[PDB]
Write a protein that binds this ligand. Sequence first.
Ligand SMILES: Nc1nc2c(ncn2[C@@H]2O[C@H](COP(=O)(O)OP(=O)(O)NP(=O)(O)O)[C@@H](O)[C@H]2O)c(=O)[nH]1
Ligand SMILES: [Mg+2]
Length: 188
Amino acid sequence: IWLYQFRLIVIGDSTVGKSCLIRRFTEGRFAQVSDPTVGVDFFSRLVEIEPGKRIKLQIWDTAGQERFRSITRAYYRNSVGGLLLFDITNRRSFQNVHEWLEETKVHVQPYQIVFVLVGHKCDLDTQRQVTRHEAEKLAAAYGMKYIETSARDAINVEKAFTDLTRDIYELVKRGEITIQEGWEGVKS
Ligand SMILES: Nc1nc2c(ncn2[C@@H]2O[C@H](COP(=O)(O)OP(=O)(O)NP(=O)(O)O)[C@@H](O)[C@H]2O)c(=O)[nH]1
Ligand SMILES: [Mg+2]
């Protein structure tokens, strides 16, 4: 059925589109109306990364609101990978990416989380407040890749999760990430 199970965490400011991204990926639908997340919700999906090779993704949908941050950060340890969103139409959400990144950098046990930077709501092209280039430069400065997604228009949603799963899978194949006693980030 699957080779590995990976735990992924999706993080970023409130309202950037984390829950909608995850629901488009797992439910294939766009939630036109979306309550702010309280604590951390759970979604799952199998992905076939290569023919006959499946990875189970256990996805933690985190609350962006500041008052739930104590809950969100409790999940960093047991995550192997994640997506860090900003909203391309919300420059303050981009300004906060460095803060989200600096905070994950002190959560490097058993490993640094494998992150991709996600410029979300890329359907709102005329409302853009962040250039692709400055987001690509920020991602590169933290050694991560960048992708622009839309939950509304189903743009790059499968690719965001699938590319990150392939990256983690290759790190596991090289032994750079391994199963660890009591860690839930990777399971055989
Ligand atoms: N145009 C557009 N709107 C989107 C997109 N994704 C989410 N939205 C909208 O953005 C708002 C917040 O989305 P939501 O996923 O709830 O955000 P969040 O990051 O989960 N918020 P929180 O951290 O508080 O739980 C909603 O109005 C939702 O419809 C997208 O790709 N495009
Ligand atoms: Mg949410």
